Amino acid sequence: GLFGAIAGFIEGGWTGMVDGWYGYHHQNEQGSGYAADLKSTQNAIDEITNKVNSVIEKMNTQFTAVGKEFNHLEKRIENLNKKVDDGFLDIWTYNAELLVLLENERTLDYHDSNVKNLYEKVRSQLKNNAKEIGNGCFEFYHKCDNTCMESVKNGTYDYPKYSEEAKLNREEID
Amino acid sequence: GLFGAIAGFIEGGWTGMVDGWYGYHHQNEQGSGYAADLKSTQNAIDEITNKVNSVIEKMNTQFTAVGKEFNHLEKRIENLNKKVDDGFLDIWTYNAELLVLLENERTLDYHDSNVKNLYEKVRSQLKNNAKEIGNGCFEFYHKCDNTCMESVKNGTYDYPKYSEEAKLNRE
Amino acid sequence: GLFGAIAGFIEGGWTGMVDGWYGYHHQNEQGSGYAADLKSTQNAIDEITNKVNSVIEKMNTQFTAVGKEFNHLEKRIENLNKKVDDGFLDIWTYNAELLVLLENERTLDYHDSNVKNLYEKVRSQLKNNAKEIGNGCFEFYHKCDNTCMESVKNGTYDYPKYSEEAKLNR
Amino acid sequence: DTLCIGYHANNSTDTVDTVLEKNVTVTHSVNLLEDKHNGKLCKLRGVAPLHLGKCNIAGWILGNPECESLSTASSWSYIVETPSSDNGTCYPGDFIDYEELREQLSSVSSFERFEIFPKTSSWPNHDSNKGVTAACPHAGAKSFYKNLIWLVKKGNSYPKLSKSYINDKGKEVLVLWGIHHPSTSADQQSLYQNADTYVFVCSSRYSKKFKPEIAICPKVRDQEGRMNYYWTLVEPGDKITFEATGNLVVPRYAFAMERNAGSGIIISDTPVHDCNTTCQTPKGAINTSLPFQNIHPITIGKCPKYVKSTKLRLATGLRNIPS
Amino acid sequence: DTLCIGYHANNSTDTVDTVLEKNVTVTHSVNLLEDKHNGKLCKLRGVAPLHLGKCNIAGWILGNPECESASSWSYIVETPSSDNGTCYPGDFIDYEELREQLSSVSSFERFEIFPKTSSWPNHDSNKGVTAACPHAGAKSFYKNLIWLVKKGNSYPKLSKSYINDKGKEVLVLWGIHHPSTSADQQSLYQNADTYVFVCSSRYSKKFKPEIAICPKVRDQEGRMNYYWTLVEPGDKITFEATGNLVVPRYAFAMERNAGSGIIISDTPVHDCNTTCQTPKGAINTSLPFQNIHPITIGKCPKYVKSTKLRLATGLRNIP
Amino acid sequence: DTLCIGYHANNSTDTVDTVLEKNVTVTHSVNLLEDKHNGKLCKLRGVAPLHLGKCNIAGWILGNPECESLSTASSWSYIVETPSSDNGTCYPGDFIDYEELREQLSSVSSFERFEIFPKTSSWPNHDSNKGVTAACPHAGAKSFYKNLIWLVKKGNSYPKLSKSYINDKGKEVLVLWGIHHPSTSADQQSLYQNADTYVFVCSSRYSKKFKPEIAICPKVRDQEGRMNYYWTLVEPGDKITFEATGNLVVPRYAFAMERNAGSGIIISDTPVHDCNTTCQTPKGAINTSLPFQNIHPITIGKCPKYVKSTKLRLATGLRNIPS
Numbered sequence A: 001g002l003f004g005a006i007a008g009f010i011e012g013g014w015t016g017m018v019d020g021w022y023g024y025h026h027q028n029e030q031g032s033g034y035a036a037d038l039k040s041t042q043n044a045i046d047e048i049t050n051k052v053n054s055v056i057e058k059m060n061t062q063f064t065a066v067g068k069e070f071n072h073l074e075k076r077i078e079n080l081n082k083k084v085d086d087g088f089l090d091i092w093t094y095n096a097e098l099l100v101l102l103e104n105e106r107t108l109d110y111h112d113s114n115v116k117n118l119y120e121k122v123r124s125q126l127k128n129n130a131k132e133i134g135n136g137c138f139e140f141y142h143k144c145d146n147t148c149m150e151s152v153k154n155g156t157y158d159y160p161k162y163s164e165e166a167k168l169n170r171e172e173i174d
Numbered sequence B: 001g002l003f004g005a006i007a008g009f010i011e012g013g014w015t016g017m018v019d020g021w022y023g024y025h026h027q028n029e030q031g032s033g034y035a036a037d038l039k040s041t042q043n044a045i046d047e048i049t050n051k052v053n054s055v056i057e058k059m060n061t062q063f064t065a066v067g068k069e070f071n072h073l074e075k076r077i078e079n080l081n082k083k084v085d086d087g088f089l090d091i092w093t094y095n096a097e098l099l100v101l102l103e104n105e106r107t108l109d110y111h112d113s114n115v116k117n118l119y120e121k122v123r124s125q126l127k128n129n130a131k132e133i134g135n136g137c138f139e140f141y142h143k144c145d146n147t148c149m150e151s152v153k154n155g156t157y158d159y160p161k162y163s164e165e166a167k168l169n170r171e
Numbered sequence C: 001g002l003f004g005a006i007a008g009f010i011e012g013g014w015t016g017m018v019d020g021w022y023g024y025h026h027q028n029e030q031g032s033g034y035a036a037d038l039k040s041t042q043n044a045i046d047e048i049t050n051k052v053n054s055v056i057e058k059m060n061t062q063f064t065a066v067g068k069e070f071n072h073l074e075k076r077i078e079n080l081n082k083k084v085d086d087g088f089l090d091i092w093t094y095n096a097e098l099l100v101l102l103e104n105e106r107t108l109d110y111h112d113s114n115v116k117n118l119y120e121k122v123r124s125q126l127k128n129n130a131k132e133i134g135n136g137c138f139e140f141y142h143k144c145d146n147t148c149m150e151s152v153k154n155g156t157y158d159y160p161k162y163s164e165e166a167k168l169n170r
Numbered sequence D, F: 001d002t003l004c005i006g007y008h009a010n011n012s013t014d015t016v017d018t019v020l021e022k023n024v025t026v027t028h029s030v031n032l033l034e035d036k037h038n039g040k041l042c043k044l045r046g047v048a049p050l051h052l053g054k055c056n057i058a059g060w061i062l063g064n065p066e067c068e069s070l071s072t073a074s075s076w077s078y079i080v081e082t083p084s085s086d087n088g089t090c091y092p093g094d095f096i097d098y099e100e101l102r103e104q105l106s107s108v109s110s111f112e113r114f115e116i117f118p119k120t121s122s123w124p125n126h127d128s129n130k131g132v133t134a135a136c137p138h139a140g141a142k143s144f145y146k147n148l149i150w151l152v153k154k155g156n157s158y159p160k161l162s163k164s165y166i167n168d169k170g171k172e173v174l175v176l177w178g179i180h181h182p183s184t185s186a187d188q189q190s191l192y193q194n195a196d197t198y199v200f201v202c203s204s205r206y207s208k209k210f211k212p213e214i215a216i217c218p219k220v221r222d223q224e225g226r227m228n229y230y231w232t233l234v235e236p237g238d239k240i241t242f243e244a245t246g247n248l249v250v251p252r253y254a255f256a257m258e259r260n261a262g263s264g265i266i267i268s269d270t271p272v273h274d275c276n277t278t279c280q281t282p283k284g285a286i287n288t289s290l291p292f293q294n295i296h297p298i299t300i301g302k303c304p305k306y307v308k309s310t311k312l313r314l315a316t317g318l319r320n321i322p323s
Numbered sequence E: 001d002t003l004c005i006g007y008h009a010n011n012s013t014d015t016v017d018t019v020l021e022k023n024v025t026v027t028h029s030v031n032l033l034e035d036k037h038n039g040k041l042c043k044l045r046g047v048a049p050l051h052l053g054k055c056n057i058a059g060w061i062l063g064n065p066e067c068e069s070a071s072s073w074s075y076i077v078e079t080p081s082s083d084n085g086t087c088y089p090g091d092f093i094d095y096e097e098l099r100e101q102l103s104s105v106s107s108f109e110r111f112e113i114f115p116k117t118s119s120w121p122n123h124d125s126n127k128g129v130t131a132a133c134p135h136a137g138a139k140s141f142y143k144n145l146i147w148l149v150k151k152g153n154s155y156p157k158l159s160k161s162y163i164n165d166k167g168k169e170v171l172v173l174w175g176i177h178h179p180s181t182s183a184d185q186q187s188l189y190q191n192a193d194t195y196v197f198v199c200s201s202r203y204s205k206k207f208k209p210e211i212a213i214c215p216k217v218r219d220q221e222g223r224m225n226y227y228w229t230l231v232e233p234g235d236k237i238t239f240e241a242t243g244n245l246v247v248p249r250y251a252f253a254m255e256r257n258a259g260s261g262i263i264i265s266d267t268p269v270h271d272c273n274t275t276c277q278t279p280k281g282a283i284n285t286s287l288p289f290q291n292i293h294p295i296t297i298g299k300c301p302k303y304v305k306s307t308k309l310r311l312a313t314g315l316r317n318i319p
C-alpha cells in the first residue's frame, strides 16, 4: 500500500460493513455496530465512475473497413496492408494492457489514500481525548456514547467538552 | 485530495500570498503576513517545468507529406492510405486525451504532496510546544516572535528552549 | 520527494547497509551496526521485478518483414510505406520515452513511500517508550539490547515488557 | 470505548493485474475488453448487407444463370460471400481489375439494373440468340450470362458493329462487356466469319482496342477458348461507344449507382439476421461500448480497437481481504 | 501566536480535466493543442512552392498555351479549378506518378532536346495544330511537343536519338496520336499501318495507332496518349516511327527531391517561412498536437480531433 | 540506545530521467532499450537465409553462368544480396513483375529445381545449341542462362512449336521464359526465318500473347537487341502450354516450391554466420528480450519496436545519496 493503510496498519477489511467502501466500527456501553462514511464513499464512487468513463469515452473511432483484397500479383501491397494492421495491433495491445496495469495500481492507491485521509480526520478531532491502540482504532480517554460517537463521524466532535475527563484517565494510564 | 492537505484539511487557498505557490501565515505581538516558501516553491516550478517540457520536447516528428493521389482504379490503396491516417488519428487522439487526464491528476497530487510535506515538517518540530487548531494552523503554547518563526521555517526550531514554558499553558 | 522520507526527514542513504534497500542502524549496550529489513526489502524486490517484467513481457510482437521494394514507377506507395514506418517510429519513440519518464518518477515515489511506512511502523511499536530525535531516528527510554532491537525489527516488539522500565527514566 | 476506521470487504472473487502484483482479488471491477459477439451478420447503419448466396461478385454482376439478378436490393452497406461461393465466371477467362470492382461495389445507396442495349431492338444485323454454352448451363440447356449478350454472325456474315449509349441516368452507370477468344481459326470463322477482327470500346475517360488472341489453352469447365471481362464507370452525361468486327460479348444490362465511400466484403458462413449493429465481424456483430475487442481484427464500421488481450479487467473497488 | 501552512490562489478561471474529475479550475495551465494557423501557403525549407494557377501539372509539363510557366520548389500548389491541362483528349499514362515525382525538385531546367529548326528535315513541323488547343483564338498546340505530320504525301521512317549530357536526370515527354478514321490516318501520316518505338537502356515500348471514332471531348473524336520517362545521365534515348508520333521538343533536366507533396487549394501564397504546411494555412508551433487539418506537409505536430488539451501546471484554484 | 530507519546507498553511477527532473543517480536500474547486435546474418527461427553472393534474385532464378545456384537445399527464412550483386540479366531487357517475384521468393520452404523440358528430347525440330551470346559469357566463351534455352531455326525452318507441361508435383511450380527481340529484320530472319512471329503462353489462369518488337536500341552489354523475361506460378493440378513461331526462350528448368507467409530481402555486406535469432537486421542479429530497439528500423521476424532513443533505462532501485 502506497499510503500504508489498507493491508498496512489496518490489516483487513470488514465484511460486516456492507453499505460502503470506507467506514467506522464503534463500541461503547450502548453496544457495537458497523457504519459506512457515506460522504467519502460517495465521492469515491463519483470519481471512479468518471475515471472509467474517461478510459471508455475518450476512444472515438473512425469508420473503417479493415479488410482489403489483393490478387496473386499484389503480394507486396498485401504485406504492406498486413504490416499496417499488425502495427495497430501491437500498438493497441501494448497500450491497453499497461493502461490497465498502471491504472489498476493507482486505483488501489486511491482507495488506500482515502482510508488514510479518513483516519487522519478522526485523529485530528480526537487529539488528546483518545489513544491510538493500532489496527486503525482509537480508544477514548472519556466516555463516548452514541451521540458523541456520531459527532466524530460527521466531524463535529467537541474536544473541549471532554478534555477534563480525558486528562484524568489519560495521566493514570500514562 | 490524495494527500489530504489541499481541498482537504486546509480548506482554501490564499490570495494574500501572491508571493508564490506554497508558504506560511504567522501572527505574533510583532506583526503578521503571508510569506511563500521560496525553497519548496522554486523546486515545484523547476520540476513542473521539466514535466511540461518533457511532454513537449519528446515529440520530435519526422518530415512527412501525408497527402497521396490515387486514380479511379486505385480505390483499394486509397482506402489503405486512409486507414493509415485514421489509425494514427485514433491513436494520437486517445493517447493525447488520456495523457492530459492522467498527468493533470498527478500534477494536482504533486502540489498536495508538497503542502503536506510542508505541514508535517512543522508538526514534527513543535510536537508539544504547540497545538493543531485545524485548517493547517499551529497555535504555539508559548511566545514565538520572528526569530522563532523564522526558525521553524528552517527546520532549526529548538524544542527544549520552550518546552517548560509550554508545559504550563496547558491548564 | 513525494512522501517526505527519502531526501526529506532522512537526508541521506546508508553506504553501510549493503544487504537491502531499507533497514535499520542500531546502537546499544553491546554494539552497533547496520541491518536491512528483510520483509519490506524482499516485498519491494518482488514488486519492482514484477513492474519491470510487465513493461517487457506485455510487449506483443507480430512476425514482420518491414522491408519493401518498389520500382521507379511506384513512388507513391513507397512513400506511403515510408509514412507507416515513420508513423510507428514516432508513436513508439514518444511512448517509450514518456513511459520511462513517468514510471521512473513513480518508482522513486514507491521507495520513498516504503521508507515512510517503515518509519511509521516502528513508531507504532515504540509508542512513547522511545523519543523521536529527528533524521528518522528513535532513542529508547529503556535498555533495549540485541533481543530487543530484534523484536522491534520483526514487528513483534513487546511493549508491555519494557513499558515499565521506560516510563521511569523521564 | 473504541472507534475503528476500516474498509469494505465482500464475497467477490474478481481478480485484476497491477504493474506491481498479479491476480489481486478486488471488491469491485469492470471489463474493458469486449470478448463476445452475437454470431450474426447484421444491418450496418440500418441498411442490410448484400448476400450473394452461392455466387461471388463476378457471377452476380455478370449475370451467371445460378445467380439472382431480379430482386437485388437497391442499396446495401456491405457485401457477403460464403467461403464456398463458386458460381462466378462460368466461361473461363480473366476478369480485369476485379478486386477494384469488388471494392467499388462494397457499398451503394442506389442500384438500378436496366437494359442498356435491349435484346429485341439493338442488334438487327447480328445473331443475339445462338450465344450460349454448356459452360454456363441453366434449366437443363446451354445458356449464358443474363447481363451480357454473346453476338454471333447472322447467316454467314458479321457486319461492322457500332453502338453507343448516352448516360441520361442521374448517376454513374456501371458497364461490363466481354471479349471472346476462340481456340482455333475455324471457330473464329464459324463464329464471326472474319479472321482478322478487332474490338473498340471508349468513353470520354475510357479507351481500349482489343484483338482476338487465338490458341488452344488447357480445358476449364470444358472450354479451350477464353473470354475476358472488362468494365468501367460511365459518368452522368458521358457516352460509351462499342465498335467491333467480331469477338465482342456485348452489354445487355448495366447498373445505375451512387457509391457510398468505402465499406468491405465479408466472406463467411455466418447467417444474416434482422439485427442492427455499428461494428460487423466475419463471425458476428459486437457492441461498441467498450474500447477494446478481441473477436476479430478485420471489422467494418465504428469498432473498438482490436487487441490480443484475453482480459482487461479494470479495478474499481479496493483489494478484498475478508479473512 | 500562530503559524499557518497554505497554498496560492488567484483570479484564474482556466480549467483542466483529470481522470477523476472534470472542469477543475486551477491557478496556472499550459496548452498542448495548437489550433491556430496563419491562413497562408508559405515556404518550406525557405523555398517557395510551385504555384500553377489555373493550370494543372499536365498542362504545365506538356506546355499548354494557357501555361507560360522557377528552378526549385518545396512543393506544388494547384487550385480547385485548375482546368487547363491536356487540351487534346487522351490518356496520361502514370500521371499521378509523374505528379508525385515533380512535387519537389532542387534543380529544374527546360531545354530544347530536339531543336525544331533542324531535327525533322523529312517531316512537317508547322501543321501540328488544333482548335482543341487554342492560343488567342487561333489553332495551336503544346509548346513542349511537336505534332509531326507528313510533307508532300510522304512520311519516311524517322529515327532520332538523344544522349543525356546533362549532369542529372532528363524528363522526356512524348505523345501518340490516334486518328478517328483511316482517311485521317493517311491524310496525316500517309502510311496507314504505322508503329512508334521508344527505348533507352531502361525504358522500351512499342506503340500502335488505335483508330476509332470515340466520343467528342473538346470537339475531338480522335485521341492522344501522353508518355514520359526519366533518362539517366549518360544514357541514350531513341525514337523510331512511321507516323502518329508527337515528338519531344522541350525536355527537362532535373534533380528530384526526397518526399514532398501537392496541395490543391485557394489559400493564397505568401512570403513567409514555415515548417508545417496545411491546405488551409501554415502552422508554426512547438506544441506536440494539432487539430487544424489531417493532411499536412513538413515536420508537423500529430493530428487529433481533440478540441481542448490543457495541461495543469499550477494547483486547484480556491479563492 | 538508538534505532534509526534508513535506505540503501552505493557506488552506483547509473543515471535515469524522470518526468520531474533529469539525470538522477539511482542505486539500481535496467535498460529497456536493446542497443547491441552480433554483426551477423543468422538463421531465422532455425532456418538459414539464402545468400546469393555476387548475384541478384534475377540472375539466380535465371541461369546466369556466374551464379552458383544452390540447390542442396531446400528452404530459407529470407534472402541476402550484397550491395555489389551486379550479375543479373546478362542480356539487356525488361523483367516483368520483378519486385513481385522477389517478394514471393523471400521465404520458401521446399524448393526443387527440375528440368521441366529436358534439353535433349524436347526440341527435335529446333536448334538448341546456337542459342548463345557474348552478353552472358562463361569461361571466355559465349554462353547463356542455365535455366532457359535460346531456340533458333534449324537449318532454314522454324516449325510452329507447341509444348505443354502438367504440374505433377504436389505444389506450385514457378516457370520462367523469355521473348527475344532482334535489332533488325535481317537478324529476325537470320534467327527465326519467319519474320512475322508470335508467342503464346497460357494455363487455366494465365494467358498472354507476345509479338516481337524489332528496333535498334542503345547498346547494353554490347547488345542492340532486347530480351524480356516473364514468369508465372502453375497450380498443383494445372497445365501450362507454350506455343510459338519464333522469338521464344523456352523454359528448361522450372521450380517446385511451397511459399510461406513471406519475409524479405536483406541487402548487406554483413557476413552470414551459424547463429540463431528471432529478429534479424541488415547490420546483424539482435535479442528479443527487451521491448524496444534502436539498431535498425528494417527488421525481419518478431522484433522489438524501433525507436529513435539513445537510452531508455528504468530505475529499479532508489535515488543514490551516498554523501
Ligand SMILES: CC(=O)N[C@@H]1[C@@H](O)[C@H](O[C@@H]2O[C@H](CO[C@]3(C(=O)O)C[C@H](O)[C@@H](NC(C)=O)[C@H]([C@H](O)[C@H](O)CO)O3)[C@H](O)[C@H](O)[C@H]2O)[C@@H](CO)O[C@H]1O
Pocket (backbone or CB within 6 Å): D130, D131, D132, D133, D134, D135, D142, D150, D152, D181, D182, D183, D187, D190, D191, D222, D223, D224, D225, D226
Ligand atoms: C457451335 C459448335 O458446336 N462449334 C463446335 C465446337 O463446339 C467444337 O469444339 C467443342 O466445343 C465444345 C463446346 O461446345 C460449345 C459450348 O457449349 O461451349 C457449344 C456452343 O453451342 C458453342 N457456342 C457458340 C456460340 O458457338 C460453343 C463455342 O463453339 C465455343 O465456346 C467457341 O470457343 O461451344 C467442347 O468444348 C468440346 O470439347 C469441343 O471439342 C468444334 C470441334 O469439335 O467444332 C465446332 O463446330
Ligand SMILES: CC(=O)N[C@@H]1[C@@H](O)[C@H](O[C@@H]2O[C@H](CO[C@]3(C(=O)O)C[C@H](O)[C@@H](NC(C)=O)[C@H]([C@H](O)[C@H](O)CO)O3)[C@H](O)[C@H](O)[C@H]2O)[C@@H](CO)O[C@H]1O
Pocket (backbone or CB within 6 Å): E127, E128, E129, E130, E131, E132, E139, E147, E149, E178, E179, E180, E183, E184, E187, E188, E219, E220, E221, E222, E223
Ligand atoms: C486530317 C484532317 O484534316 N481531318 C479532318 C477532320 O479534322 C475533320 O473533322 C473535324 O475536325 C475538327 C477539328 O479540325 C482540326 C482541329 O483539331 O482543330 C483542324 C486541324 O488542322 C487538324 N490538325 C491536323 C494536324 O491535321 C485536326 C486533326 O485533323 C484532328 O485533330 C485529327 O484527329 O483537326 C473538329 O474536330 C470537328 O468536330 C470535326 O468534324 C473532317 C470533317 O471536317 O475532315 C477531315 O478531313
Ligand SMILES: CC(=O)N[C@@H]1[C@@H](O)[C@H](O[C@@H]2O[C@H](CO[C@]3(C(=O)O)C[C@H](O)[C@@H](NC(C)=O)[C@H]([C@H](O)[C@H](O)CO)O3)[C@H](O)[C@H](O)[C@H]2O)[C@@H](CO)O[C@H]1O
Pocket (backbone or CB within 6 Å): F130, F131, F132, F133, F134, F135, F142, F150, F152, F181, F182, F183, F186, F187, F190, F191, F222, F223, F224, F225, F226
Ligand atoms: C543474327 C546475327 O548473327 N546477327 C549479326 C549481329 O550479331 C551483328 O551485330 C553484332 O553483334 C555482336 C554480338 O554477336 C552475337 C553475340 O551477342 O555474341 C553473336 C551470337 O552468336 C548471336 N547469338 C545468336 C543466338 O545468334 C548474337 C545474336 O545475333 C544477337 O544477340 C541478336 O540480338 O549476337 C555485337 O553485339 C556487336 O556489337 C554487333 O555489332 C551484325 C554485325 O556484325 O551482323 C548480324 O548479322
Ligand SMILES: *[C@@H]1O[C@H](CO)[C@@H](O)[C@H](O)[C@H]1NC(C)=O
Pocket (backbone or CB within 6 Å): D011, D012
Ligand atoms: C455475494 O453476495 C451477493 C448479495 O447477496 C450474492 O447475491 C452473491 O451470490 C454473492 N457472491 C457469490 C458469487 O457468492
Ligand SMILES: *[C@@H]1O[C@H](CO)[C@@H](O)[C@H](O)[C@H]1NC(C)=O
Pocket (backbone or CB within 6 Å): D022, D023
Ligand atoms: C494469475 O497469476 C498466475 C500466476 O502468476 C498467472 O498464470 C495467471 O495468468 C494470472 N491470472 C489468470 C488466472 O489468468
Ligand SMILES: *[C@@H]1O[C@H](CO)[C@@H](O)[C@H](O)[C@H]1NC(C)=O
Pocket (backbone or CB within 6 Å): D045, D046, D047, D276, D277, D278
Ligand atoms: C442502428 O443503430 C445505429 C447506431 O447504433 C443507428 O445509426 C441506426 O440508425 C440504427 N438503425 C436505424 C435504421 O435506426
Ligand SMILES: *[C@@H]1O[C@H](CO)[C@@H](O)[C@H](O)[C@H]1NC(C)=O
Pocket (backbone or CB within 6 Å): D064, D065, D066, D086, D087, D088, D089, D090, D135, D136, D137
Ligand atoms: C455453380 O457452382 C457449382 C459448384 O458449386 C458448379 O458445379 C456449377 O457449374 C456452377 N454453375 C455455374 C453456371 O457457374
Ligand SMILES: *[C@@H]1O[C@H](CO)[C@@H](O)[C@H](O)[C@H]1NC(C)=O
Pocket (backbone or CB within 6 Å): E064, E065, E066, E083, E084, E085, E086, E087, E132, E133, E134, E135
Ligand atoms: C483553359 O481553361 C478554360 C476553362 O478553365 C477553357 O475554357 C480553355 O479552353 C482552356 N484552354 C486550353 C487551351 O486548355
Ligand SMILES: *[C@@H]1O[C@H](CO)[C@@H](O)[C@H](O)[C@H]1NC(C)=O
Pocket (backbone or CB within 6 Å): E043, E045, E046, E271, E272, E273
Ligand atoms: C526563410 O528562410 C530563408 C533562409 O532559409 C531566409 O532567407 C528568408 O528570409 C526566410 N523568409 C522569411 C520571410 O522569413
Ligand SMILES: *[C@@H]1O[C@H](CO)[C@@H](O)[C@H](O)[C@H]1NC(C)=O
Pocket (backbone or CB within 6 Å): F064, F065, F066, F086, F087, F088, F089, F090, F135, F136, F137
Ligand atoms: C558479372 O558482374 C560483373 C561486375 O558487375 C560484370 O562486369 C560482368 O559482366 C557480369 N557477368 C555476367 C556474365 O553477368
